[PDB]
RNA sequence: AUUUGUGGGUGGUGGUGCAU
């Protein structure tokens, strides 16, 4: 149980953040980050009631001052809650400018984005509109290449789904650095999407979406060389079996004529 | 009269917004004065104390060790490229004519 | 130890009738 003075100060700070979107943040917020109990202070202050600009300022302060793990966990929780709340509040599932700024700050934070936030959004299963908005934001502000490759590999290792597929499409649009292991993960995701004729699979025999088709087309256009002869033939087989008509032909052609690592 | 009442209503709402901003600033100042120290003392007196991560670390190590990237753009139409070249040639010819003119 | 010299992409968190 927090003290009475602690609860009063946290409530005052939370109310100030809720009612303040412009001006200067309180010294309570300025000194909260200087302590070790950041999570406890946030929980006592109930930061879920803050305003969008105040939330963006708090996220920027946490990124600039707080450490790796503490700011990562705080960003994960606060960003997931705020994204869900904003998606629910907006009828067309739209975000605010301050929300986008906070998202850019979180993406710049490498550990808090992929491990903390992107892992949280994907694990919670962001909807199709949320995944599309996230892909747009990532294409706007791409993160460092190492984090991008790690996130692409994590999405490929994760099962095929709307969020993982949209993340893969955004990564393909970004065209980051694909290592041997990154290309192997991409080929593994393509194989998991493709069907197998002793034990079959739901994702194997399922039909891919238009976003997945566009992602496959971009991947065939870009990372053909990262795929060897065997992986290129596997991509051609995927385009033949679980490919498309308007995009499947280009996928098969690029898989047949692409370079090898 | 309608425009005068419009100006009056706009000024009244602007004054209400300014008063709200002043009240918010006063509340924030009071928070910074008292609640800041209270929360600092309370936090000083109190305390508040992986597969995906491993896969990401392995992927990052592999990306640092090796890489094979080919950011090749989509191929355009030959007719479109020829038309663009013709337009560039026309612009160059126009520039040459202008230079000859002065 | 994130940043620089050099290249380089760059419009639709678009409006939009109509059918469904």
Swiss-Prot record, chain A:
GO biological process, alphabetically ordered: endonucleolytic cleavage in ITS1 to separate SSU-rRNA from 5.8S rRNA and LSU-rRNA from tricistronic rRNA transcript (SSU-rRNA, 5.8S rRNA, LSU-rRNA); maturation of SSU-rRNA; poly(A)+ mRNA export from nucleus; rRNA processing
Predominant subcellular localization, coarse grouping: cytoplasm
Keyword Cytoplasm included in the entry's annotation: yes
The entry's keywords: Cytoplasm, Nucleus, Phosphoprotein, Ribosome biogenesis
GO cellular component term of the entry, any: preribosome, small subunit precursor
GO-annotated molecular function: snoRNA binding
Modified residues (Phosphoserine): 199
Localization annotation: Cytoplasm; Nucleus, Nucleolus
Note: Present with 21600 molecules/cell in log phase SD medium.
Protein role: Required for normal export of the pre-40S particles from the nucleus to the cytoplasm. Its subcellular location and association with pre-40S subunit shifts from mixed cytoplasm/nucleus to all nuclear in RPS19 disruptions, suggesting it acts after the ribosomal protein.
Protein family per UniProt: Belongs to the bystin family.
Protein name, per record: Essential nuclear protein 1
Lineage: Eukaryota, Fungi, Dikarya, Ascomycota, Saccharomycotina
Gene name per UniProt: ENP1
Curated annotation (Swiss-Prot), chain B:
Cell location: Nucleus, Nucleolus
Chain positions covered by the region annotation Disordered: 62-94
Source domain of life: Eukaryota
Protein family per UniProt: Belongs to the NOP14 family.
Function: Involved in nucleolar processing of pre-18S ribosomal RNA. Has a role in the nuclear export of 40S pre-ribosomal subunit to the cytoplasm.
Subunit note: Interacts with snoRNA U3. Interacts with EMG1, MPP10 and NOC4. Component of the ribosomal small subunit (SSU) processome composed of at least 40 protein subunits and snoRNA U3.
Name of protein: Nucleolar complex protein 14
Organism this protein belongs to: Saccharomyces cerevisiae (strain ATCC 204508 / S288c) (Baker's yeast)
Lineage of the organism: Eukaryota, Fungi, Dikarya, Ascomycota, Saccharomycotina
GN (gene name): NOP14
Part of the whole protein covered: 204 to 316 of 810
């Amino acid at each position: 149980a927090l003290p009475e003075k602690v609860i009063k100060a946290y409530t005052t700070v939370g109310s100030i953040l809720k009612t303040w979107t412009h001006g200067k943040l309180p010294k309570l917020f300025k000194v909260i980050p200087s302590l070790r109990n950041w999570q406890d202070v946030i929980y006592v202050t109930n930061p879920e009631e803050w305003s969008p600009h105040v939330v963006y300022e708090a996220t920027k302060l946490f990124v600039s001052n707080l450490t790796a793990k503490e700011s990562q966990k705080f960003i994960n929780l606060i960003l997931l809650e705020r994204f869900r709340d904003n998606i629910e509040t907006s009828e067309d599932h739209s975000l605010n400018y301050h929300i986008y700024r906070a998202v850019k700050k979180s993406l710049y934070k490498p550990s808090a984005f992929f491990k903390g936030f992107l892992f949280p959004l994907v694990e919670t299963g962001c909807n199709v509109r949320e995944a599309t908005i996230a892909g747009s934001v990532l294409a706007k502000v791409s993160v460092p290449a190492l984090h991008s490759s790690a996130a692409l590999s994590y999405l490929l290792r994760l099962p095929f789904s709307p969020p993982t597929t949209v993340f893969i499409k955004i990564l393909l649009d970004k065209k980051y650095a694909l290592p041997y292991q990154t290309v192997d993960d991409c080929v593994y995701y393509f194989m998991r999407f493709r069907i197998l004729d002793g034990s079959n699979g739901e994702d194997a025999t399922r039909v891919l979406p238009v976003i997945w088709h566009k992602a496959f087309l971009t991947f065939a256009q870009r990372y053909k060389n990262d795929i060897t002869q065997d992986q290129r033939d596997f991509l051609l087989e995927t385009v033949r079996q679980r490919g498309h008509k308007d995009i499947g032909p280009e996928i098969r052609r690029e898989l047949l004529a692409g370079a090898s690592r | 009269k309608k425009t005068k009442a419009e100006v009056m209503k706009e000024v009244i709402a602007k004054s209400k917004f300014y008063k709200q901003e002043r009240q918010k600033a006063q509340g924030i100042m009071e928070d910074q004065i008292d609640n800041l120290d209270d929360n600092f003392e309370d936090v000083m007196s109190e305390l508040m104390m992986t597969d995906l991560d491993k896969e990401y670390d392995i992927k990052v190590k592999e990306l640092q060790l090796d890489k094979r990237a080919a950011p090749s753009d989509r191929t355009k139409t030959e007719e479109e490229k020829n038309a663009e070249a013709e337009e560039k040639k026309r612009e160059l010819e126009q520039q040459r004519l202008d230079r000859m003119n002065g």
